[PDB]
């Protein structure tokens, strides 16, 4: 996260962190329930082995409260497209249940039509992650959040050097030095309604971090609510 603030205790409980072979975080994720994590499809290709840590607020200190879970089943969207990052979404089923606690809690999946009318029409959303705090900088050891404005689609497309499909949306600032960054990818974008936080995006891509005339590109979760449920309905093995 570029700009924004560090997360206080229990402020971003749905944040997950994908850690590679070297116990190193490389992508974010969102807790959907005790068994499912939501992340970006492209993150799957960025580590040979990976697990999921929850409840981490500082990576430097094993402050307790952290918990690491094995992935039992990786459910990648089959339509994920490497050149465009269209369908940049995936669900992970965990081998063992997440125990909810302080700093460890699921974000809400919204009904589609309602979220179209009620969430995507709000001014801002929140994105969070352990990503670089500077494009030329270094991955944060501490969980950060950042309020980001919704950018109307036309603005979004025309600001962009690359194809913005209908399965994506723009969020962030034109010139202000606040944006998501490398490392945040796969992480949560949520939208508040009456003190409840709903999943509305996944951190996907962008042309640098906080560059003038550029926004962060997010996977539009409303487009995939139906797909997320079908992937979660499977539950555990037969």
């Amino acid at each position: 996260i570029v700009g924004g603030q560090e997360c206080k205790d229990g402020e971003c409980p749905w944040q997950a962190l994908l850690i590679n072979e070297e116990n190193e975080g490389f992508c974010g994720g969102t807790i959907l329930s005790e068994f499912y994590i939501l992340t970006a499809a492209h993150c799957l290709y960025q580590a040979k082995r990976f697990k999921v840590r929850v409840g981490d607020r500082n990576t430097e200190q094993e402050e307790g409260g952290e918990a690491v879970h094995e992935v039992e089943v990786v459910i990648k969207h089959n339509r994920f497209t490497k050149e465009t990052y269209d369908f940049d979404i995936a669900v992970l089923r965990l081998k063992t249940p997440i125990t909810f606690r302080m700093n460890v809690a699921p974000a809400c999946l919204p009904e589609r039509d309602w979220a179209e009318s009620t969430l995507m029409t709000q001014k801002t959303g929140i994105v969070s992650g352990f990503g670089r705090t500077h494009e030329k900088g270094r991955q944060s050891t501490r969980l950060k959040m950042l309020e980001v404005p919704y950018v109307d689609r036309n603005s979004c497309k025309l600001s962009s050097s690359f194809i913005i499909t209908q399965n994506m949306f723009c969020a962030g600032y034109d010139t202000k030095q606040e944006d998501a960054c490398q490392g945040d990818s796969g992480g949560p974008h949520v939208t508040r309604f009456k003190d409840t936080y709903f999943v509305t995006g996944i951190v996907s891509w962008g042309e640098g971090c906080a560059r003038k005339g550029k926004y962060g590109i997010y996977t539009k979760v409303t487009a995939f609510l139906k797909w997320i449920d079908r992937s979660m309905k499977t539950r555990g093995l037969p």
Partner: protein, 84 residues
Amino acid sequence: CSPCQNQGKCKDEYTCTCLEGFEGKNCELFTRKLCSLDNGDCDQFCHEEQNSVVCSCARGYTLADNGKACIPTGPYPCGKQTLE
């Protein structure tokens, strides 16, 4: 007392006792609204059903018997920052 609206009752200033479906000092405002306004007074999801509003809730909540509020089923319902 004629100030009251929508056939509400005016009891002498004054006070208005409205019929069901109306509110406001003069019963000049409709209570029955669609999701487009005040989210139909639902705490969470709102969706229409025969020009009628029907509220629902996310996972691990249950719809209060009043058909509008959402009742958690535990200490860690979805979408809530953890207090403890």
